């Protein structure tokens, strides 16, 4: 199970550096949304550039790191885009 998390900041001139990234690419490695959930080692491949990094929180799950759409009766742990010492944006959710 691999969870890819990437984002880019707004581009060009006059950008908000700490606002939510304009581009986000959350990819679960073999998930298909219409086929539904994906059911051995969890992996994380988050973005890391300058002061910006990607993280995954624990949310309701009693464990700490499968769908990008809600799994009724499950726990959704949010995928975050964090600016070191300033702002954190929920850019996604990984449901289990």
């Amino acid at each position: 199970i691999v969870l890819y998390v990437n984002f880019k900041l707004r581009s060009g001139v006059g950008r908000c550096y700490n606002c939510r990234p304009a581009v986000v690419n959350i990819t679960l490695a073999n998930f298909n949304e219409t086929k539904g959930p994906l059911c051995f080692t969890t992996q994380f491949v988050g973005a890391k550039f300058d002061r910006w990094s990607a993280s995954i929180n624990t949310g309701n799950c009693p464990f700490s790191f499968f769908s990008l759409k809600d799994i009724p009766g499950g726990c959704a742990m949010p995928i975050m885009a964090n600016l070191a010492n300033l702002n954190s944006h929920t850019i996604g959710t990984l449901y289990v």
């Binding site: 060009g12 001139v13 006059g14 950008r15 908000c16 550096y17 700490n18 002061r51 070191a84 300033l86």
Partner: protein
């Protein structure tokens, strides 16, 4: 010819503007003559209030395109019919565009005037001007503004006085790849320019009714960080992309919104706009400017690196932000009628900055710093006969030089001090209540000082506050006459007497006062450490048993120095106070320990106590750890340094300070785990820096080893600076003074390749600490090359060189030989004030009197009053060195053992 209206400096009452539209287009590349320029156009709509056959409007350094043979086109409004233009002319001394009409305008008819014009986008930090910076190998050019006080007229023609309030419709035409910013938000997204799609057009919502000096226009490649305030206002911090990405705007973001919301709640008055931008310019004269919705900062007042800026830099940022946000009420919403009441803007913002900064950082106790930073800073100048009243008669303020002269310690620090005293005698809640009424009543209007007393009088009446007389009659004593009283206490009888405190008792006070220099004074006092009942002094002399003592009792007046007065005591009370300091100084409040020091040195200089009493008040400092009494001592003894650091007295003086500071230096060495840690309390951090700086100045050799080893360690590992930012300024200067060409060349390259301005500032001052004279001469030549030191830093660096005893004569000779050239090309006031404060001989005085004579016809502009104050101080210094040299020399020798 003063008979002609266009030769007079005030505008006629005949025309009032109603609204403007202005379109400006900066060209951020040089033209074939090598100039950066901006092209622009404007329409002003104005009402004729009194019939006149001339339009007089302000215009500075603008070249006009001729339309129909004239510099303007005049049009009617609502069916009014304008006369033909006979002639237009520019009158340079009064900075007017004059439009002569073949007939008179009609009373109450509106008219519109169209103009098309060009101007230089100069590196002069005034009007609409260019700021530059490097992004990699590429030099970026920014277009940006500074209109206060009288430079809006330099960007577009307008009725450029602060009571000529109007609304403004701003359009900026800019390169397609650059953002445009103004006071308001854009009316919609930026559109291409039809004639050339490499340019875009941005148009901004109409401003509120506003003064011309508050307009701002900026075109840059800046990025920003954003946060929405608790009152819904959008806050953005704008700076160079690399500074924003690194986080140097993040502290300003953390505090700007909360402070703005705090002031809105505190004064019961909303900030009436959707957004407040804070922007940091690489090139900026005055530190910060309060433009409504677009506050402009000097980088060192806005940006902050938590790993490389010091605690004093952080205090600077939050204080200036709080000062500018204060102006959004005192200055932008309610505005001065004319520049003679400047303290209504700047005194309020200098007081209220501490309330906002205290709100954002309540662990710092910044409100206490107002005594050193404002009260005692301004009493130095307000004790001269060459001082001026908080409110000056408006007839006396006319020219731009006279206006700029008022941006001084009187308008700022004395304004702040009387508001500190005015907000102490009556409750702060009572104070803010009357100010809320004032803000509500005069919103979008203009005020004189009498309007302030009325709304404070309502608050005292509504709060059942008892006072000896009206707010009006109390505060006119502190506002319409210069100076302050000294209160002299006889503690055997409990008698108080007051008189005008003057530095030199032989000074000639020529400005009359309608109160004959008598004040109405709120007296706080403590007895043996317990606060007594308040008292009001209403006569020149009075008695109350509050001020009577017996036995071992001592009393102090002016608890925590809330009043704007100096206190002198009889001989017995002084001796008991000195005994208290030796036995247990903690029984005297920390602020009043600084009061005891600072008053005695100033009283001694005025021949009101013996100079040995003032010096004896410094004996307890060997066991003092607080920042404030030491700082008041080091500040008062900087006069002794200035008088003696070229004389045999300086050795013994340094010997005394070595003996007084060395235990405190050893304490901090210990308390910091050998300078590896810094204190938690902010005042303790400042006390540490003062202890290190004083140790190294006066020759504690453990300090000289410490600073040179750190700086040697830095030079050996340049990318890993081992010096904590709190110590960089003292470490850098002393390492440069003790070092050679290698230490200087290293710090110069570190200044040229600097990315933080807070770091370049420390290196720029420290490089003036060279003891080699040939180095200081090279450095002085650098300060006037804009490729090496920014024009915004030239005076500041020259002053750092003059503070060096080796540089004193170099700069004074430079000033004397280059005055004409310098002036015809920059704070002449601060340079005059700094280059002359060592003067203590008749020889220095005749150079100063001759420096006056040699340049009388060029004039001195806004330096005019600093020159008269220098003449008065120099004369007092000659007498003071005569009367004190031997007494002071002997005291230092005896007490440094």
């Amino acid at each position: 010819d003063q008979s002609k209206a266009w030769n007079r400096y005030r505008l006629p009452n005949t025309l009032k503007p109603d609204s403007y539209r202005v379109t400006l287009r900066p060209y951020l590349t040089p033209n074939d003559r090598g100039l950066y320029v901006f092209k622009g156009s404007s329409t002003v709509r104005f009402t004729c209030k009194e019939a006149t056959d001339v339009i007089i409007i302000h215009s500075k350094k603008l070249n006009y395109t001729l339309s129909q043979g004239h510099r303007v086109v005049l049009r009617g409004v609502g069916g009014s019919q304008p006369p033909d233009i006979d002639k237009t002319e520019l009158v340079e001394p009064t900075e007017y565009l004059v439009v002569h009409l073949k007939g008179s305008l009609v009373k109450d008819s509106q008219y519109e005037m169209d103009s098309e014009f060009e101007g230089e986008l100069a590196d002069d930090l005034a009007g609409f001007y260019r700021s530059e910076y490097m992004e990699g190998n590429v030099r970026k050019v920014v277009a940006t503004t500074q209109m206060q006080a009288a430079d809006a007229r330099k960007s577009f023609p307008c009725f450029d006085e602060p009571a000529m309030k109007a609304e403004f419709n701003i359009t900026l035409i800019h390169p397609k790849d650059l953002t445009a910013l103004s006071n308001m938000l854009p009316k919609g997204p930026s559109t291409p320019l039809p004639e050339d799609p490499n340019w875009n057009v941005t148009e901004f919502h109409t401003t509120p009714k506003m003064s011309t000096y508050l307009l701002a226009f900026i075109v840059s490649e800046f990025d920003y960080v954003e946060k929405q305030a608790s009152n819904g206002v959008l806050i953005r911090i704008w700076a160079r992309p690399s500074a924003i990405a690194a986080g140097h705007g993040d502290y300003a973001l953390n505090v700007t919104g909360p402070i703005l919301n705090f002031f809105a709640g505190h004064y019961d008055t909303p900030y009436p706009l959707p957004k407040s931008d804070q922007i940091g310019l690489p090139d900026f004269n005055a530190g910060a400017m309060e433009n409504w919705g677009l506050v402009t900062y000097r980088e060192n007042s806005l940006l902050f690196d938590p790993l490389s800026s010091s605690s004093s830099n952080k205090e600077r940022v939050v204080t200036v932000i709080a000062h500018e946000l204060a102006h959004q009420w005192f200055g932008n919403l309610v505005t001065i009628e004319w520049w003679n009441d400047l303290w209504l803007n700047e005194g309020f913002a200098s007081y209220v900055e501490y309330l906002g900064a205290d709100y954002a950082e309540p662990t710092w106790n910044l409100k206490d710093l107002m005594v050193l930073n404002d009260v005692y800073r301004v009493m130095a100048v307000d004790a001269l006969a060459s001082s001026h009243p908080l409110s000056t008669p408006a007839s006396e303020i006319n020219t731009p030089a006279q206006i700029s002269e008022l941006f001084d310690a009187i308008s700022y620090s004395k304004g702040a001090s009387v508001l500190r005293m005015l907000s102490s005698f009556l409750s702060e809640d009572v104070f803010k209540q009357g100010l809320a009424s004032y803000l509500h009543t005069f919103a979008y209007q203009n005020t004189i000082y009498l309007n302030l007393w009325d709304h404070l009088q309502e608050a005292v009446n509504n709060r059942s506050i008892q006072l000896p007389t009206t707010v009006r009659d109390i505060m006119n004593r502190w506002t319409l006459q210069m100076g302050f009283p000294v209160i002299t206490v006889d503690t055997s009888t409990g008698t108080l007497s007051q008189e005008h405190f003057l530095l030199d008792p032989d000074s000639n006070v020529t400005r009359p006062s309608e109160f004959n220099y008598v004040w109405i004074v709120p007296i706080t006092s403590i007895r043996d450490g317990r606060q007594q009942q308040d008292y009001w002094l209403i006569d020149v002399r009075a008695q109350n048993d509050l001020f009577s003592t017996s036995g071992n009792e001592w009393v102090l007046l002016n608890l925590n120095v809330t009043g704007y007065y100096r206190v002198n005591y009889d001989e017995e009370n002084w001796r008991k106070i000195q005994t208290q300091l030796q036995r247990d100084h903690s029984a005297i409040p920390v602020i009043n320990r600084a009061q005891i020091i600072n008053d005695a040195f100033n009283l001694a200089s005025a021949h009101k106590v013996p100079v040995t009493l003032a010096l004896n008040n410094t004996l307890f400092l060997i066991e003092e750890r607080q920042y404030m009494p030491w700082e008041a001592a080091l500040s008062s003894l900087s006069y002794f340094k200035l008088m003696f650091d070229r004389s045999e007295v300086y050795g013994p003086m340094k010997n005394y300070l070595k003996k007084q500071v060395t235990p405190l230096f050893i304490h901090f060495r210990n308390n910091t785990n050998n300078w590896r840690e810094i204190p938690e309390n902010l005042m303790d951090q400042y006390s540490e820096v003062n202890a290190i700086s004083t140790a190294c100045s006066n020759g504690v050799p453990e300090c000289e080893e410490m600073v040179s080893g750190l700086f040697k360690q830095w030079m050996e590992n340049p990318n890993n600076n081992p010096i904590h930012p709190n110590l960089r300024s003292t470490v850098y200067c002393n390492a440069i003074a003790q070092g050679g060409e290698e230490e200087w060349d290293f710090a110069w390259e570190q200044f040229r390749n600097a990315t933080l301005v807070n770091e370049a500032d420390k290196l720029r001052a420290a490089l003036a600490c060279s003891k080699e004279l040939w180095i200081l001469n090279r450095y002085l030549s650098y300060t006037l090359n804009p490729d090496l030191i920014r024009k915004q830093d030239a005076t500041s660096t020259i002053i750092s060189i003059t503070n060096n005893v080796i540089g004193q004569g170099l700069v004074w000779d430079f000033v004397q030989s280059n005055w004409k050239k310098l002036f015809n090309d920059f704070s002449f006031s601060n340079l005059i004030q700094a280059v002359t404060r060592r003067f203590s001989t008749e020889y220095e005085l005749q150079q100063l009197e001759q420096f006056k004579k040699d340049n009388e016809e060029t004039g001195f502009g806004s330096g005019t009053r600093a020159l008269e104050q220098a003449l008065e101080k120099t004369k007092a210094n000659i007498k003071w060195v005569k009367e004190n040299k031997e007494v002071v020399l002997q005291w230092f020798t005896e007490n440094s053992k």
